[PDB]
């Protein structure tokens, strides 16, 4: 069935989505979960939005990521205008035309993170670790808590994700490659990868590892 | 919400 959360709206705007929900017997929750089917985003005239946690978890889940205009237009035309026509196309960081959520909604038999062990390491801001972890799981990766907990062998491909910012140490994130044998990278590798829903390649995101 |  239909269950929604909204992102980047004002109370008045939210009151409109609620009005929408009421009419169409659609559920409306504060927090995105397994069940959540729609993510309603604030966008500019052309369906570009800002990047928010729900934005990512939305794409990651292959949910409908639709512009707020889906709501107000349906209201205005006293009916529900199928989501296909209002889907969000891009964002203020990853380009106005990348068709992110689209590829996602479509590529659910091939998660950009098939055969990956990812370990979100150290502190993050504005995004709790377990949420980043949930994200990459939805993308098919498998989470690993400790650097030393990486599966050994060849089967899989390990990766260490850090967000340099939230650090206060000077022997911290430069020395990860000493405690394990995995590529290191910034969170950006994940978000940008999730935005485009195209498995970006570590090249541009690697961090300097002291041997 | 926080943005990224
Ligand atoms: Cl916000
Ligand atoms: Ni390989």
Domain co-membership, A42 together with A20: yes
Across the interface, whether the CB atoms of B4 and A93 are under 8 A apart is answered: yes
A121, A147 Cβ separation under 8 angstroms: yes
∠A23-A26-A27 over CA atoms, to 5°? 130
d(CA A114, CA A119): 15
Q: What are A90's strand-pairing partners?
A: A48
Residues A84 and A166 grouped into a single domain: no
Strands A38-41, A3-7: parallel, antiparallel or unpaired by DSSP?
parallel
**What does the alpha-carbon distance between residue A26 and residue A33 come to, in Å, rounded to a whole number?**
15
Could you give the maximum distance between any two Cα atoms of chain A, in Å? 64
Distance of alpha carbon A30 from alpha carbon A59, whole angstroms: 17
In whole angstroms, what is the distance from residue A33 CA to residue A147 CA? 28
Alpha carbon A49 to its chain centroid, in Å, reads 13
Q: Are A153 and A125 in contact (CB under 8 A)?
A: no
Solved by what technique? X-ray
Å between B2 CA and nearest CA of chain A: 6
Q: Rounded to whole angstroms, how far apart are CA atoms A23 and A149?
A: 50
Q: Which of A177, A180, A179, A178 is nearest to A206 (CA)?
A: A177
Neighbour-count burial of A195, counting CB atoms closer than 10 A to its CB (0-12 exposed, 13-18 middle, 19+ buried): buried
Q: Computed from CA positions of residues A100, A101, A103, A108, in that sequence, does the dihedral angle turn out positive or negative?
A: positive
Same domain assignment for residues A113 and A145: yes
Q: Of chain B residues 1-4, which have a CB less than 8 A from chain A?
A: 1-4
Collapse the DSSP code of A55 into the 3-class scheme (helix H, G, I; strand E, B; otherwise coil) and give the result. Answer: helix
How far does the CA of residue B3 sit from the closest CA of chain A (Å)?
A: 5
d(CA A61, CA A44): 23
Polymer length in residues for chain A: 211
Distance CA B2, CA A210 (A): 33
A30, closest residue in chain B (CA to CA): B1
Count contacts between A and B (CB, < 8 Å).
20
Asked if residue A112 and residue A207 are part of one domain, the reply reads yes
CA dihedral of residues A154, A191, A137, A107 (deg, nearest 10): -90
Q: In whole angstroms, what is the distance from residue A160 CA to residue A121 CA?
A: 7
How far, in Å, CA of A33 to CA of A128, rounded? 15
Helices A188-195 and A129-138 pack at an angle, to 10 degrees, of 40
> How far off is chain A from B4, nearest CA to CA, in Å?
5
Domain span at A20: 1-107
Tokens of A71: 């709501």
| Ligand in nearest proximity to the CA of A49 | 1
Comparing CA positions, the residue from A58, A24, A26, A60 lying closest to residue A41 is A58
Total domains in the fold of chain A:
2
DSSP assignment of A68-120 = THHHHHHHHTTS---GGGTB--EETTTBS---HHHHHHH-TTS-TTTTEEEEE
Residues A187, A130 share a domain: yes
Count the alpha carbons within 13 Å of A23 in the hemisphere toward its beta carbon. Answer: 15
Could you give the 3-state DSSP secondary structure of residue A6? strand
Same domain, A125 and A71: no
- Count the neighbouring beta carbons within 10 Å of the beta carbon of residue A131: 14
8 Å CB contact between A192 and A148: no
Q: Are A100 and A195 in contact (CB under 8 A)?
A: yes
**Residue A101 to residues A66, A96, A124, A128, A177: CA-CA distances in angstroms?**
9, 13, 24, 22, 34
Do the Cβ atoms of B4 and A126 come within 8 Å? yes
Judge if A14 and A56 occupy the same domain: yes
> Are residues A24 and A50 in contact, defined by beta-carbon separation less than 8 angstroms?
no
What phi and psi values does residue A149 have, to the nearest 5 degrees? -100, 5
Q: What is the CATH classification number for the domain harbouring A133?
A: 3.40.50.10190
């Amino acid at each position: 069935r239909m269950s929604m959360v909204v992102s980047g709206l004002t109370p008045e705007e939210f009151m409109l989505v609620y009005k929408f929900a009421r009419k169409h017997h659609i559920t409306l929750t504060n927090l995105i979960t397994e069940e959540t089917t729609h993510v309603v985003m604030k966008t500019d005239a052309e369906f570009v939005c800002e990047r928010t946690l729900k934005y990512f978890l939305g794409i990651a889940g292959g949910k409908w990521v639709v512009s707020y205009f889906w709501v107000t237009q349906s209201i205005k035309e006293r009916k529900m205008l199928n989501e296909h026509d209002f889907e969000v196309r891009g964002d203020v960081v990853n380009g106005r035309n990348h068709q992110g959520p689209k590829r996602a909604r479509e590529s659910q038999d091939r998660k950009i993170f098939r055969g990956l062990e990812i370990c979100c390491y150290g502190p993050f801001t504005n995004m709790p670790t377990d949420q980043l972890e949930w994200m990459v799981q939805l993308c098919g990766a498998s989470v690993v808590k400790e650097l030393s907990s990486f599966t050994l062998g060849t089967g899989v491909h390990p990766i260490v994700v850090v967000q340099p910012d939230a650090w206060t140490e000077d022997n911290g994130f430069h020395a990860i490659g000493q405690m394990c044998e995995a590529p290191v990278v910034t969170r950006e590798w994940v978000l940008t990868s999730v935005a485009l829903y195209q498995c970006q390649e570590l090249d541009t995101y690697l961090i300097p590892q002291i041997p | 919400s926080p943005t990224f």
